[PDB]
Ligand binder design. Sequence first.
Ligand SMILES: [Mn+2]
Ligand SMILES: [Mn+2]
Length: 269
Amino acid sequence: ATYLIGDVHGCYDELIALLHKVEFTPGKDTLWLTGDLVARGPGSLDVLRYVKSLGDSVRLVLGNHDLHLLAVFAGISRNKPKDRLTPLLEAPDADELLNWLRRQPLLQIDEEKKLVMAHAGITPQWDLQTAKECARDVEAVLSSDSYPFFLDAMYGDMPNNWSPELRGLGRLRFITNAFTRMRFCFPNGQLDMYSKESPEEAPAPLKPWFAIPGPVAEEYSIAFGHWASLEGKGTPEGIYALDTGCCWGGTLTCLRWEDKQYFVQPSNR
Ligand SMILES: [Mn+2]
Ligand SMILES: [Mn+2]
Protein backbone atom coordinates (compact mmCIF):
# COMPACT_ATOMS: atom_id res chain seq x y z
CA ALA A 1 0.00 0.00 0.00
CA THR A 2 1.01 3.67 -0.46
CA TYR A 3 0.65 6.00 2.52
CA LEU A 4 0.99 9.81 2.47
CA ILE A 5 1.52 11.74 5.73
CA GLY A 6 1.71 15.50 6.28
CA ASP A 7 4.14 17.65 8.27
CA VAL A 8 5.55 15.66 11.19
CA HIS A 9 7.33 18.58 12.91
CA GLY A 10 9.17 16.45 15.41
CA CYS A 11 6.02 14.61 16.50
CA TYR A 12 7.77 11.23 16.63
CA ASP A 13 5.26 9.50 18.94
CA GLU A 14 2.27 10.47 16.78
CA LEU A 15 4.06 9.40 13.61
CA ILE A 16 4.84 5.94 14.99
CA ALA A 17 1.33 5.56 16.42
CA LEU A 18 -0.23 6.44 13.05
CA LEU A 19 2.04 4.08 11.16
CA HIS A 20 1.15 1.31 13.61
CA LYS A 21 -2.57 2.08 13.04
CA VAL A 22 -2.28 1.33 9.30
CA GLU A 23 0.25 -1.50 9.87
CA PHE A 24 2.90 0.22 7.76
CA THR A 25 5.25 -2.53 6.59
CA PRO A 26 8.46 -1.63 4.74
CA GLY A 27 8.86 -3.92 1.76
CA LYS A 28 5.09 -4.16 1.32
CA ASP A 29 4.29 -0.45 1.70
CA THR A 30 5.75 2.91 0.68
CA LEU A 31 5.44 6.10 2.73
CA TRP A 32 5.42 9.60 1.26
CA LEU A 33 6.24 12.51 3.60
CA THR A 34 5.44 16.17 2.79
CA GLY A 35 8.53 17.51 4.62
CA ASP A 36 8.93 19.73 7.66
CA LEU A 37 10.06 16.63 9.51
CA VAL A 38 11.62 18.76 12.24
CA ALA A 39 11.08 21.67 14.63
CA ARG A 40 8.40 22.65 17.16
CA GLY A 41 7.63 19.12 18.31
CA PRO A 42 9.95 17.50 20.83
CA GLY A 43 11.38 14.64 18.77
CA SER A 44 13.10 15.94 15.62
CA LEU A 45 16.12 13.74 16.39
CA ASP A 46 14.11 10.50 16.53
CA VAL A 47 12.06 11.50 13.49
CA LEU A 48 15.18 11.93 11.36
CA ARG A 49 16.75 8.71 12.63
CA TYR A 50 13.60 6.72 11.78
CA VAL A 51 12.87 8.27 8.38
CA LYS A 52 16.51 7.87 7.29
CA SER A 53 16.40 4.21 8.36
CA LEU A 54 13.43 3.62 6.05
CA GLY A 55 15.59 3.93 2.93
CA ASP A 56 13.75 3.19 -0.29
CA SER A 57 10.50 2.69 1.63
CA VAL A 58 10.06 6.44 2.09
CA ARG A 59 9.71 9.23 -0.51
CA LEU A 60 10.36 12.58 1.18
CA VAL A 61 10.33 16.15 -0.02
CA LEU A 62 12.11 18.93 1.88
CA GLY A 63 10.10 21.67 3.61
CA ASN A 64 11.03 25.14 4.77
CA HIS A 65 11.80 24.06 8.34
CA ASP A 66 14.05 21.32 7.04
CA LEU A 67 15.99 23.92 5.07
CA HIS A 68 16.12 26.25 8.06
CA LEU A 69 17.54 23.39 10.15
CA LEU A 70 20.22 22.95 7.51
CA ALA A 71 20.89 26.71 7.64
CA VAL A 72 21.35 26.56 11.45
CA PHE A 73 23.60 23.50 11.18
CA ALA A 74 25.74 25.27 8.59
CA GLY A 75 26.14 28.39 10.75
CA ILE A 76 24.14 30.50 8.32
CA SER A 77 21.11 31.21 10.51
CA ARG A 78 20.43 31.61 14.23
CA ASN A 79 18.76 28.86 16.27
CA LYS A 80 15.33 29.94 17.58
CA PRO A 81 14.54 28.47 21.02
CA LYS A 82 10.94 27.68 20.01
CA ASP A 83 12.08 25.30 17.23
CA ARG A 84 13.45 22.78 19.81
CA LEU A 85 16.30 21.70 17.51
CA THR A 86 19.11 21.59 20.06
CA PRO A 87 18.93 17.83 20.85
CA LEU A 88 19.26 17.05 17.14
CA LEU A 89 22.00 19.60 16.54
CA GLU A 90 23.96 18.26 19.54
CA ALA A 91 23.46 14.60 18.67
CA PRO A 92 26.60 12.59 17.91
CA ASP A 93 25.10 11.50 14.58
CA ALA A 94 24.04 15.05 13.61
CA ASP A 95 26.46 15.13 10.66
CA GLU A 96 25.19 11.81 9.28
CA LEU A 97 21.54 12.79 9.67
CA LEU A 98 21.87 16.30 8.24
CA ASN A 99 24.11 15.32 5.33
CA TRP A 100 21.45 12.75 4.47
CA LEU A 101 18.72 15.36 4.85
CA ARG A 102 20.24 17.85 2.42
CA ARG A 103 20.45 15.20 -0.34
CA GLN A 104 16.66 14.62 -0.34
CA PRO A 105 14.37 15.85 -3.11
CA LEU A 106 12.20 18.90 -3.35
CA LEU A 107 9.78 17.07 -5.67
CA GLN A 108 8.45 13.51 -6.01
CA ILE A 109 6.60 12.15 -9.06
CA ASP A 110 4.92 8.76 -9.58
CA GLU A 111 3.71 8.41 -13.17
CA GLU A 112 1.67 5.22 -12.67
CA LYS A 113 -0.28 6.94 -9.88
CA LYS A 114 -0.26 10.28 -11.73
CA LEU A 115 0.78 11.75 -8.41
CA VAL A 116 3.04 14.71 -7.62
CA MET A 117 4.32 15.76 -4.18
CA ALA A 118 6.11 18.92 -3.03
CA HIS A 119 6.10 20.63 0.37
CA ALA A 120 4.03 23.69 -0.51
CA GLY A 121 2.56 22.52 -3.83
CA ILE A 122 3.26 23.32 -7.51
CA THR A 123 2.93 26.96 -8.54
CA PRO A 124 0.50 27.36 -11.48
CA GLN A 125 3.29 29.24 -13.30
CA TRP A 126 5.17 25.92 -13.74
CA ASP A 127 4.54 23.03 -16.09
CA LEU A 128 5.88 19.64 -15.09
CA GLN A 129 9.12 19.91 -17.11
CA THR A 130 9.93 23.27 -15.52
CA ALA A 131 9.12 22.01 -12.02
CA LYS A 132 11.45 19.08 -12.65
CA GLU A 133 14.31 21.27 -13.87
CA CYS A 134 13.94 23.70 -10.96
CA ALA A 135 13.90 20.90 -8.40
CA ARG A 136 17.00 19.40 -9.97
CA ASP A 137 18.83 22.75 -9.87
CA VAL A 138 18.18 23.39 -6.18
CA GLU A 139 18.83 19.76 -5.20
CA ALA A 140 22.20 20.09 -6.95
CA VAL A 141 23.19 23.10 -4.86
CA LEU A 142 21.91 21.51 -1.64
CA SER A 143 23.81 18.27 -2.24
CA SER A 144 27.03 20.07 -3.21
CA ASP A 145 29.98 20.86 -0.96
CA SER A 146 29.12 24.53 -1.30
CA TYR A 147 25.61 24.23 0.14
CA PRO A 148 26.07 26.86 2.92
CA PHE A 149 26.45 29.53 0.22
CA PHE A 150 23.16 28.47 -1.34
CA LEU A 151 21.40 28.36 2.02
CA ASP A 152 22.58 31.90 2.67
CA ALA A 153 21.41 33.03 -0.75
CA MET A 154 17.98 31.39 -0.42
CA TYR A 155 16.56 33.93 2.05
CA GLY A 156 14.46 36.62 0.39
CA ASP A 157 10.92 37.29 -0.78
CA MET A 158 11.74 38.42 -4.36
CA PRO A 159 11.38 37.84 -7.24
CA ASN A 160 7.84 36.46 -6.85
CA ASN A 161 7.04 35.98 -10.56
CA TRP A 162 8.44 33.05 -12.55
CA SER A 163 10.15 33.51 -15.91
CA PRO A 164 12.50 31.19 -17.84
CA GLU A 165 14.71 34.31 -18.11
CA LEU A 166 15.29 34.48 -14.35
CA ARG A 167 18.98 33.98 -13.66
CA GLY A 168 21.18 33.56 -10.64
CA LEU A 169 20.23 34.39 -7.08
CA GLY A 170 16.72 35.53 -7.94
CA ARG A 171 16.10 32.28 -9.79
CA LEU A 172 17.16 30.10 -6.84
CA ARG A 173 15.18 32.21 -4.37
CA PHE A 174 11.97 31.94 -6.43
CA ILE A 175 12.38 28.19 -6.85
CA THR A 176 12.91 27.80 -3.11
CA ASN A 177 9.96 29.97 -2.16
CA ALA A 178 7.65 28.22 -4.66
CA PHE A 179 8.51 24.73 -3.44
CA THR A 180 8.68 25.43 0.30
CA ARG A 181 6.86 28.66 1.31
CA MET A 182 4.04 29.26 -1.24
CA ARG A 183 0.43 29.60 -0.10
CA PHE A 184 -1.40 32.44 -1.85
CA CYS A 185 -1.10 33.66 -5.43
CA PHE A 186 -2.22 36.83 -7.15
CA PRO A 187 -4.53 36.27 -10.14
CA ASN A 188 -1.58 36.13 -12.53
CA GLY A 189 0.05 33.41 -10.39
CA GLN A 190 2.64 35.65 -8.74
CA LEU A 191 3.55 34.47 -5.23
CA ASP A 192 2.44 36.35 -2.14
CA MET A 193 5.02 35.81 0.62
CA TYR A 194 3.16 37.46 3.53
CA SER A 195 -0.32 36.00 4.10
CA LYS A 196 -0.38 32.73 6.14
CA GLU A 197 -4.14 32.87 6.91
CA SER A 198 -6.89 30.52 5.71
CA PRO A 199 -8.30 31.25 2.24
CA GLU A 200 -11.49 32.74 3.74
CA GLU A 201 -9.47 35.15 5.97
CA ALA A 202 -7.03 36.25 3.23
CA PRO A 203 -7.29 39.78 1.65
CA ALA A 204 -8.38 40.13 -1.97
CA PRO A 205 -7.33 39.49 -4.70
CA LEU A 206 -5.29 36.66 -3.18
CA LYS A 207 -6.35 33.10 -3.97
CA PRO A 208 -4.79 29.76 -2.99
CA TRP A 209 -2.19 28.53 -5.44
CA PHE A 210 -4.41 25.52 -6.16
CA ALA A 211 -7.36 27.77 -7.05
CA ILE A 212 -5.51 28.96 -10.17
CA PRO A 213 -5.63 26.45 -13.06
CA GLY A 214 -2.13 25.17 -13.73
CA PRO A 215 -0.78 22.62 -16.20
CA VAL A 216 0.52 20.19 -13.57
CA ALA A 217 -2.71 20.13 -11.57
CA GLU A 218 -4.72 19.58 -14.75
CA GLU A 219 -2.91 16.27 -15.36
CA TYR A 220 -1.62 15.13 -11.94
CA SER A 221 -2.86 14.79 -8.43
CA ILE A 222 -0.81 16.98 -6.08
CA ALA A 223 -0.20 16.12 -2.44
CA PHE A 224 1.37 18.78 -0.24
CA GLY A 225 1.76 19.87 3.37
CA HIS A 226 2.97 23.22 4.77
CA TRP A 227 -0.29 25.19 4.90
CA ALA A 228 -1.54 24.34 8.38
CA SER A 229 -4.24 27.06 8.55
CA LEU A 230 -5.87 25.33 5.58
CA GLU A 231 -6.57 22.49 8.05
CA GLY A 232 -6.56 20.02 5.16
CA LYS A 233 -9.91 21.41 3.98
CA GLY A 234 -11.23 23.36 1.04
CA THR A 235 -9.29 21.84 -1.79
CA PRO A 236 -10.36 20.96 -5.35
CA GLU A 237 -10.58 17.41 -6.58
CA GLY A 238 -7.12 16.00 -7.11
CA ILE A 239 -5.49 18.34 -4.53
CA TYR A 240 -4.56 16.77 -1.18
CA ALA A 241 -3.65 19.15 1.64
CA LEU A 242 -2.15 16.78 4.19
CA ASP A 243 -0.84 19.20 6.88
CA THR A 244 -3.43 19.19 9.66
CA GLY A 245 -1.20 20.83 12.27
CA CYS A 246 -0.04 18.00 14.53
CA CYS A 247 2.69 20.07 16.19
CA TRP A 248 0.05 22.80 16.79
CA GLY A 249 -2.30 20.55 18.76
CA GLY A 250 -4.05 19.52 15.56
CA THR A 251 -3.75 16.02 14.11
CA LEU A 252 -1.38 13.95 12.02
CA THR A 253 -3.08 12.78 8.82
CA CYS A 254 -2.29 9.70 6.70
CA LEU A 255 -3.94 9.04 3.30
CA ARG A 256 -3.86 5.53 1.80
CA TRP A 257 -3.64 6.04 -1.95
CA GLU A 258 -5.24 2.83 -3.22
CA ASP A 259 -8.66 3.54 -1.68
CA LYS A 260 -8.17 7.19 -0.66
CA GLN A 261 -8.87 6.21 2.92
CA TYR A 262 -7.82 8.63 5.64
CA PHE A 263 -6.36 7.69 9.05
CA VAL A 264 -5.84 10.30 11.77
CA GLN A 265 -3.67 10.44 14.89
CA PRO A 266 -4.52 13.07 17.51
CA SER A 267 -1.75 15.36 18.72
CA ASN A 268 -0.28 14.57 22.14
CA ARG A 269 0.24 18.28 22.91
MN1 LIG B 1 6.16 24.43 5.84
MN1 LIG C 1 4.97 22.89 8.48
